[PDB]
Write a protein that binds this ligand. Sequence first.
Ligand code: BCL
Ligand code: BCL
Ligand code: BCL
Ligand code: BPH
Ligand code: MQ8
Ligand code: H4X
Ligand code: CA
Ligand code: CA
Ligand code: CA
Ligand code: CA
Ligand code: FE
Ligand code: MG
Lengths: 257, 66, 84, 318, 70, 72, 73, 43, 42, 41, 42, 272
Amino acid sequence: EFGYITQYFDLAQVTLWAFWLSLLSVIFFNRREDKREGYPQEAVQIFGKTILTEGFPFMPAPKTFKLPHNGGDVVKPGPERPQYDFKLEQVDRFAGAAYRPVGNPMLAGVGPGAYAVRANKPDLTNAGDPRIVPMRVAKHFAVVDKDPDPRGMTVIGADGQVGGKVTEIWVDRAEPQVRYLELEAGNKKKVLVPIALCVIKGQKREVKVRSINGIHFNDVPTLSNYDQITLAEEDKVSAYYGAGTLYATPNRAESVL
Amino acid sequence: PFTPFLLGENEIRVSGNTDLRNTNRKSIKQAEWTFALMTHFSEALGVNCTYCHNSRAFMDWNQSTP
Amino acid sequence: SDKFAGMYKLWTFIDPRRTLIFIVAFQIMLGILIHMIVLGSDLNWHNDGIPRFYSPRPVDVAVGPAGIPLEIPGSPMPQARNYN
Amino acid sequence: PEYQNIFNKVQVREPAYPGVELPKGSLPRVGKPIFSYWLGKIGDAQIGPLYLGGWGIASLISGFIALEVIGLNMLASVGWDPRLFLKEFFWLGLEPPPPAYGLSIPPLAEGGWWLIAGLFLTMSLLLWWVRVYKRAKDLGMGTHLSWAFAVAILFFLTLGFIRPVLMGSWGEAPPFGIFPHLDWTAAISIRYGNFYYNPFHGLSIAFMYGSAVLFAMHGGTILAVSRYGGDREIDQITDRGTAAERAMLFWRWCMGFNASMESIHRWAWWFAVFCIINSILGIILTGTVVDNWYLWAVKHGVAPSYPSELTIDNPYLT
Amino acid sequence: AKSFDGMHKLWMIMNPVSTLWAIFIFQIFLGLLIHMVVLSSDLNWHDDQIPVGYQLQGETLPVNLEMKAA
Amino acid sequence: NAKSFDGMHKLWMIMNPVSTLWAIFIFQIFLGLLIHMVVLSSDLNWHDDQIPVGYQLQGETLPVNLEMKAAQ
Amino acid sequence: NAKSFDGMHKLWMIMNPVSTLWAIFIFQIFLGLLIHMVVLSSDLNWHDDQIPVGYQLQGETLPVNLEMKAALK
Amino acid sequence: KPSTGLTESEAKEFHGLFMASMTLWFGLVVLAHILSWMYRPWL
Amino acid sequence: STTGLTEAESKEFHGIFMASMTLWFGLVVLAHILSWLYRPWL
Amino acid sequence: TTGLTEAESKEFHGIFMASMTLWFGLVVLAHILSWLYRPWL
Amino acid sequence: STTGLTEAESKEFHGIFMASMTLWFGLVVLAHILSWLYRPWL
Amino acid sequence: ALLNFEKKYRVRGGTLVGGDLFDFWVGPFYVGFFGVSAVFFATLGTMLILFGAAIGPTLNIWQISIAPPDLSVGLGFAPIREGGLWQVITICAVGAFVSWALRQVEIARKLGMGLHVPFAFSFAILAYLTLVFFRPVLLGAWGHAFPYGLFSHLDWVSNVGYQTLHFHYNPAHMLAISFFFINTLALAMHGSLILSVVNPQKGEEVKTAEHENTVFRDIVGYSIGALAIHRLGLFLAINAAFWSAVCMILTGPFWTRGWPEWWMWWPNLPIW
Ligand code: BCL
Ligand code: BCL
Ligand code: BCL
Ligand SMILES: CC[C@H]1c2cc3[nH]c4c(c3C)C(=O)[C@H](C(=O)OC)c4c3nc(cc4[nH]c(cc(n2)[C@@H]1C)c(C(C)=O)c4C)[C@@H](C)[C@@H]3CCC(=O)OC/C=C(/C)CCC[C@H](C)CCC[C@H](C)CCCC(C)C
Ligand SMILES: CC(C)=CCC/C(C)=C\CC/C(C)=C/CC/C(C)=C\CC/C(C)=C/CC/C(C)=C/CC/C(C)=C/CC/C(C)=C/CC1=C(C)C(=O)c2ccccc2C1=O
Ligand SMILES: COC(C)(C)CCC/C(C)=C/C=C/C(C)=C/C=C/C(C)=C/C=C\C=C(C)\C=C\C=C(C)\C=C\C=C(/C)CCCC(C)(C)OC
Ligand SMILES: [Ca+2]
Ligand SMILES: [Ca+2]
Ligand SMILES: [Ca+2]
Ligand SMILES: [Ca+2]
Ligand SMILES: [Fe+3]
Ligand SMILES: [Mg+2]
C-alpha cells in the first residue's frame, strides 16, 4: 500500500525531543560562562543615570585561578583595577553617540590606542625566569642563516622617513620565536616595536612600519629595566603603535569614499 | 549484475512500504547489486537517474516519470 | 482632549537623527514590499493585457497518450517538458 | 600592505627542549629531537621526542597487525602484483562476510580476515584511549581531550560493531577501501529511504557547518589581534589585556553578543562533540527502528509535495 | 477597587525608552505577520476576483480576442 | 492553612522585580504565538474553514466572472 | 500653514550634507536597476517582443542559410 | 537596586500620557475591526 | 538583601503584582468562555 | 539625555507634525486615484 | 552645530539642493511622457 | 548596555562610506551605512520569502518553497509568479551578505585590528555566488540554481548529485570533504587543550605553554604551537569552502559524463 501508517508515536520522535532539550541547555551553561569578564554591564537610563544589569541568564558564582610561583589568586567574576584617565567629548547628545579625543590623539589612550591595566610583573617560564628577554640575556639563541638578520637594518616609517636602527632582538624562551625588535630612535632612546607590525626586506635591508610616521618614533613608551618586560609595558607599547592606525595622518579617520 | 537480473530472475526492489521496522529483510549488499544494474541502465541509454526517478524517493511510482 | 498637550517632550529622551533614519528606511522598504505584493496578484497592472498585449502569447504543445509531449523519430536528444 | 602573520619571516634556534619533568617511576623519552626549516616556516620546528610506555606499545602492535592484514588482502585481490596494486589502488578493499552467515565466525577468505582486522583495530583504539588519558593526567591537566576521544571511538564502534549486532549480520558493516567505503555510504542511504530525511543527520550537518564557521571566526580573530599579544591565550585568560578586550568588542558590536577568551573554547568543544553525538543517534536508529526515512518524514509533516499533472500506473497492480 | 493605586510608579523601575522601542518594533512585526497570515487563507482580498477579475477582463477585450482569432 | 503564606512577599528580596517582569512578558508573548499556531494547525482552524461562507468560491461564481469565462 | 515649513533649512544642521548626497545617489542607482528589471519581466518587455522584427527568425530564413541547409540533405 | 532616575512626579506625568496614547491606539483598532466585520465576516 | 529592596518595598511590589496577575487571569477566563460558546472543543 | 532642551523639542515637534500631515495627505490622494482606476474591494 | 554648518551655510546648501531635485524630477516627467506616447500601460 | 571597559573604545572614524551621519550604536550593535543597508535588505528578503509562502499551498515551516524560473527563460526575466520573486530575493541576499562583510571591515578599522574575518567570510560569499551566478551563467540559464526552502533545497541537492550517477567520485568533492573532517578534529583538540590547561586537576596551579607543547609531543611526537594552530584553523576552513566552489563549477560546465569515469585517467597512464 506504499504509505500505510500503523502508529503515530515512535522512538525517533521522542529522541529528537530529548536532543532539543539537551541543546537549549548547553546554550544556557555556555552563556553563563561567557559573563565572567566585563560584567555587570552598565545600562544608561532615560536621563543619564547608569545602573548595573547582568543580562539573561544571570552571572555565575565566582571561581578561582591559582597562579604559579606564588603569583596570587584570581577571582572571576571579581573586582576590577581602576581605569587610568582618558578624556573624551561626546559628539551628539544621546547614549549611543560616538566620542572624540580631547588633546593630542596619539598621546591620549583612547580609541585604538586604549590599553588595559595588567600586573607590573613579567610573564614567567616553567622554571621561574622571565619569558620575553633580549638575545644578550638569553645567550643560547641564534638566528638561523637562510633568514635575514634584522640587526643593523633601518626602520622606515610609513611616510618614507627614517625612524632609527635595529640594535637588538627580543625572544620568547617558552616557545622559541621572535617577539620584539629594539631600535635606537632619532633622539637616542631605546624603543620596541612588535614583530607583527614590521615588514622586513632583506635586500633593501629595511624594516617598513606602516603604522606610524618617522617622527613618531621619538614618543614610543619606554621600559624601566631593559633586561625584562612586564605585562603592563607590553600593553602600553603595543597600544601606542595601534593608535597610529587611525591618528597618524589627519586623513586616516575620514571615510575612504 | 546481468547473471542474477537479466538471465536469472531476482527481485530488484529493496525499500519498505511503511516507515517503521516491518517484515523487510533485504540488506545493503542487495542494495549495491541493484545500484550496479541501474548504473548500466543509465549508461546504455545516455541518461541519468532522473530520466526515470525523483531521487528523493527512488521507490515511489507516483513520483516517477512515464 | 488637552491630555496630549505635552507630547513634544517626547523629543527630550528620543533623539531626532536615529528616528528620522529609521522612519525613512522603513517607509522605502514598505513601499517596495507593497508594490511587489500587489504585482503578484490578480490586481497586477503591468501584465494584465489592458489596454492591449504587446508581447507574443504562449503556445501550448500537444501531448501523447502518456500525457507528455511526443518524441520526434530521428532526433538525437529527447524532448523537454516542465511538469512531469 | 601590512604583515599578515601567516609565515615566520625570521627563525631562531636554541637547544631542544626535553619536556616538563614527569612523576618519579616513569620511563625515559625515546628519540633525539630534530629541526625542520619548512615546518618552522609555519609553526614549531622541533620533531620529537616521544613517550612510549605500556599502553602505547600494545597499541601500535595491535594497529600494525591490523594494517598488515588489510594490506595483504588488498594485495591478494590483484594476484600479488604490486604494479596492479598501484594501478587500481582506489578500487581495492577488504570486504565483510556475506550477510547469510549472520553473527557466526565465517571461514578466513570469506569474511574472517575482515573480522580479525576489525577486532585488532578496536583493541588498538581502546589502548590509545588509555594512553591519552594517562598522558594528560600525569602532567596534572584536566582530562578534557579523553572525553572527546571517547565520543569519536563510540561512533567508530556504532557503525561497525553495535549496529551490525543489533541487526544480526556482520555484512551490514563498512569494508576497508576508499571507493568501497564510499559505495557503502551511498547504498545505506538508498536502502533506508534517503538520509536527507533523517533528522539526526540534518542536525549533525548543522554542527559540521558550524564547526567550520566557528573555527574560521576564531582563527581570524586571534590572528587579527596578535599585534597586541593575542596569540598567548593563557595570559589573556588569567590577566585580561587589550587583545582580549578588542576581540570581544568586535563580536559584540558586530552581532550583539560575545564570549570571553576562555568561554569560546567551550563553544568549540561542544560544536565538535554534538556533530558526532547526532551521528551516533542517527545511525543507531536506522534499520532497527525506522525502515524508510522518507515515509517517516511524510508521517510527521515534513516533506514538501510537488504538483503532479500526470498518472503513472504501477505495473505490479495491473 | 483601590488595588491599582501605585501603578504609576511602574516607570521608576522600568525604563521608558526601552519599553517604547520594544512596543513599536513588536507592533510593526505583528502587523506584517497577521496581514501575511490572513492573505494565505480563504479570506484573501487581493486575489478573490471581487468585485471583478482583471486578468480575465484583459483576456477578453475585443482587441485581444480579434488578434487571438488570427 | 490561614497563615502559611504570610511571608510570601519576601520573594522580592531574592528575585529582582525588573528582570522577572521582563521574563514574564517575553514568555507570555512566546506562549501566545505558540498556542495560536498549534490550534490553527488542527481541525479547529477558523480562517480556512469556509464558515460562514467560502470567499474564493464566491468570487469564482459572480455572474460577471462567469460570463467572461464563458466567452473563451 | 503658509509658514509651517520655513525652518526647514535647519535640516542640514543635524544631517550631514555629503553623507546624504552619497546615500541619495546610491539609492537612486539601485532603484533604477530594480524598476527596469521589474518592467522587463512583464508583458511590457521591449527587448524580446519581436517588434519591429524578430531577428533570430530573420536569420533562420535567409536565402543563403536555406540553400546551405537544403544541400546538406 | 534598579532605578530609572525618575522621581514620582515625572513617573505620574509619563503614566498619564502613556495611558492616553494606548487608549487612543486601541480605539483605532476596534474601529478597523468593526469595518472589517461589516465587509467580510470571518466567524 | 540581595535585591536591594527593603521589606516595605517588597510588600508594595507584591500587592500590585498580585492585583495585576489576578486581572490578567480574569481576562483569560473570559476569552475561554467566549470561545466555548462559539466553538466547543471537548 | 538626548541633549535637546524644551525649546528645541518644541521646534522639532512643530516641523515633524507638519511634514507627517503633508505625507499622509499625498497618500490619501494616491489611494483615491487608485480606487477610481481599479477598485479592489 | 553638530554638523558644523552655520545657519547661512545651511541656507545655501538648501537652495541648491532644492533646485537640483526639481531639475531631476523634471527629467523624470519627460521620460514618462515619452514612454506613454510609445507604449501606454494603463 | 556597555561592558565595564567599553567606553574608552567608542570613538568616531574608521568608516568607508557615509561619514559622521551613520556613526552611532543602537544598544550593543554598531550601525553605520552598511548596518542600515544590511537590515534593510534582510527585512525585505524575509518579507518576500513570507509572501511567496502565502501564495503557495501551506505555511508549514518545513514545506515552504520558492523556486527559480524554468530553463526556457534562459538568462532573461521571469514572471513574478513563476520565477521573478526568486530573482528579487536573490538580489536582496547578495546585497545583505556584502553589506555584512563591509560592516565588519568598518568595525575592525575602528578597533585597530587586521582584516582576517571579513576576508574568510568572502569565501562563503564566493561559494554562494558560484551556486547562483557563475554556474548558471556558464550553463546558460538562471533555472540551474537552488530553490529557497528547508527540505526543498535538499531535493535539489539530491537530484543534482544523481545527475552524475555517483557524485562521491568527484575529485574536488573528495578534497573538500577531507578538509571538513580534519577541521572538526582540529577544533575538538584545540578546545580540549586550552580548557585542560586552565582547569587542571583539583588543587593545582594553572599550567603553562611548556605543558601545552609537552602533552602533544608525548602523545604524538610533534606540537605545532599556540599561534600556528590559529593559522592552521583559518587555512582548513577557507580551503574547505574553496574546493567546494571548484567542485560545483566543474559539474555540468566542464564534465558531463559520470564522475567515476573521470578517474579513469589514472589506471590508463602508460606506466603500469
Ligand atoms: C478559536 C480560538 C479563537 C481565539 C481564542 C483565544 C483564547 C482562548 C485566548 C485568546 C487570547 C488572545 N487572542 Mg485570540 N482567538 C482567535 C483569534 C485571534 C486572532 C486572529 C487574527 O484570528 C488574533 C490576532 C487573536 C489575538 C489574541 C490576543 C489579543 C490574545 C493573546 C494575548 C497575548 O498573547 O498576551 C501576551 C502578552 C502579555 C501578557 C504582555 C503583557 C500585556 C500587557 C499588560 C497589555 C496587553 C493587552 C492585551 C493585548 C489584551 C488587551 C485587553 C484590553 C482590555 C483591550 N486571537 C480565535 C477566534 N484567543 C488570549 C487572551 O485573551 O488573553 C487575555 C486567550 O486566552
Ligand atoms: C481583510 C482585512 C482588511 C484589513 C484589516 C485590518 C485590521 C483589523 C487592522 C488593520 C490594521 C492596519 N492595516 Mg489593514 N486590512 C486590509 C488591508 C490592508 C492593506 C492592503 C495593501 O491591502 C494595507 C497596506 C493595510 C494596512 C494597515 C495599517 C494601516 C494598519 C496596521 C498598522 C500598524 O501595524 O501599526 C503599527 C504602528 C504603530 C503602533 C505606530 C504608533 C504611532 C505611529 C507613529 C503612527 C502610525 C500610523 C498608523 C499606521 C495609521 C493610524 C491612522 C492614522 C490616523 C492615519 N491593510 C484588509 C482589507 N487592517 C490595524 C489597524 O487599524 O490599526 C489601528 C488593524 O487593527
Ligand atoms: C546525492 C548528493 C551527493 C552530494 C551532492 C552535493 C551537491 C550538489 C553539493 C554538494 C556540496 C558539498 N558537499 Mg556533497 N554530496 C553528497 C555527499 C556528501 C557527504 C557525505 C558524508 O556523504 C559530505 C560530507 C558532503 C560535503 C559537501 C561539502 C563539500 C559541500 C557543502 C559545503 C559547502 O558547500 O559550503 C559552502 C557554503 C555555502 C554555500 C554557504 C553560504 C553562506 C552564506 C553566504 C551566508 C548565509 C547567511 C544566512 C542567510 C544568514 C541567516 C542568519 C540568521 C540570523 C542565523 N557531501 C552526496 C553523494 N554535495 C555543495 C557544494 O560543494 O557547493 C559549493 C553542493 O552544491
Ligand atoms: C569529536 C569528533 C572528532 C574527533 C576527535 C578526536 N579524534 C582524536 C582525538 C580527538 C579528541 C584524540 O585525542 C586522538 C588523538 O590522539 O589524536 C591526536 C584522535 C585521533 N583521531 C585520529 C584520526 C581521525 N579522527 C577523525 C574524526 C574525528 N576525531 C571527529 C571529527 C577521523 C575522521 C573524520 O575520519 C580520523 C581519520 C587519529 C590521528 C587519533 C587516534 C590515533 C590512534 O588511534 O592511533 C593508534 C592506532 C593505530 C592504527 C596505530 C597504527 C598507525 C596509524 C595508521 C597511524 C595514524 C595515522 C593517521 C590516522 C593517518 C590517516 C589515515 C587515513 C587516511 C586512513
Ligand atoms: C531584524 C530587525 C527586526 C531589526 C530591527 C532592529 C533595528 C531597528 C536595528 C538594530 C541595528 C543593527 C544594525 C542590527 C543588526 C543585527 C541583526 C538585526 C541581526 C544579526 C544577528 C546575527 C546575524 C546573529 C547570528 C548569531 C549566530 C547564529 C552565530 C553563529 C556562531 C556562534 C553560535 C557563535 C557563538 C560563539 C561566539 C559568541 C563567538 C564569538 C567570539 C569569537 C569567534 C572569538 O574568537 C573570540 C575570541 C576572544 C574573545 C571573544 C571571542 C568571541 O566572542
Ligand atoms: C602491501 O601492503 C603491506 C602489507 C606491505 C602493508 C601496507 C598497508 C596499506 C597500504 C593499507 C591500506 C589501507 C586502507 C586504504 C584502508 C582504508 C580504510 C577505510 C577508509 C576504512 C573505513 C571504514 C571501516 C570501518 C568503520 C570498520 C569498522 C569495524 C569494526 C568496528 C569491527 C568490529 C569487530 C569486532 C569488535 C570484532 C568481533 C569479533 C567476535 C570474535 C567478537 O565475533 C564473535
Ligand atoms: Ca496594464
Ligand atoms: Ca478583492
Ligand atoms: Ca471562518
Ligand atoms: Ca522591441
Ligand atoms: Fe584559541
Ligand atoms: Mg562493496
